[PDB]
Amino acid sequence: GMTEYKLVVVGAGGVGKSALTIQLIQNHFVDEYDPTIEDSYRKQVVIDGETCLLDILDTAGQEEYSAMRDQYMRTGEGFLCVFAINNTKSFEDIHHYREQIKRVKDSEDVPMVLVGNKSDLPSRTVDTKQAQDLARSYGIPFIETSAKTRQGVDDAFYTLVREIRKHK
Ligand SMILES: C[C@H]1CNCCN1c1nccc(-c2noc3c2CCC[C@@]32CCCc3sc(N)c(C#N)c32)n1
Ligand SMILES: Nc1nc2c(ncn2[C@@H]2O[C@H](COP(=O)(O)OP(=O)(O)O)[C@@H](O)[C@H]2O)c(=O)[nH]1
Ligand SMILES: [Mg+2]
């Protein structure tokens, strides 16, 4: 049967979670997507010769630490932790998302990728070295993406699938 992988995209508002997801789903850049919409989207893809079904939850909205939201996030098999390379605050929020994932999955070993998005923009405030070093601190891959140009988009999502496969 076709394996389904449940991927969750997290990160500060405005980093490009929706734009990255919609680039994977539609193969089109969106400059506008209601910031409040949290939804899931599926796509069949071939990864390492295997056709698999990705189910991508594009998160949104305010923090909610209910038992119900925790149980829902625990359905995620792997997480993309996204910041924007021109927004320091988004990078400094990554530890919060990482800690919430560790908490809800009750594991220090959750499939995860650190994603530095908006790599097409000239306004960089987060050095690549600092981001690489954070991914090294976590023991996870780091991928530089642009939802606008498609830079890194398959690399980010496919790497996460490969991390889930290895965790199994
Ligand atoms: C960086 C902080 C603190 N400073 C203010 C902004 N902020 C902020 N804003 C908005 C949202 C989130 C946030 N935090 O965790 C989460 C989010 C949204 C995605 C879901 C997730 C991560 C995956 C595991 C769990 S489990 C659970 N119940 C969650 C929730 N909700 C989460 N943090
Ligand atoms: N240039 C550029 N803009 C981007 C990129 N990704 C997202 N954006 C823009 O950043 C803003 C927020 O993107 P959005 O996907 O709504 O972020 P979300 O709140 O994380 O879902 C929008 O205007 C997007 O067009 C990217 O890689 N490059
Ligand atoms: Mg969004």
Experimental resolution (Å): 1.0
Query: What are the sequence ranges of the domains in the chain?
Result: 3-167
What kind of experiment solved this structure? X-ray
Is the CB–ligand 2 distance for residue 61 below 6 Å? no
| Residue 21: C-alpha distances to residues 52, 97, 112, 137 (Å) | 16, 18, 16, 26
Region at 139 (left for phi over 0; alpha for psi -120 to 50; beta for the rest): left
3-167 carries CATH number 3.40.50.300: yes
Ligand 3 (ion): which residues have CB within 5 A? 17-18, 60
| Closest by CA position to 162, among listed 38, 50, 67, 57 | 50
State in Å: Cα 30 to ligand 2 middle: 8
Q: Which residue has 């991914």 as its token pair?
A: 135
Is the CB–ligand 2 distance for residue 13 below 6 Å? yes
Strands 4-11, 78-84: pairing kind: parallel
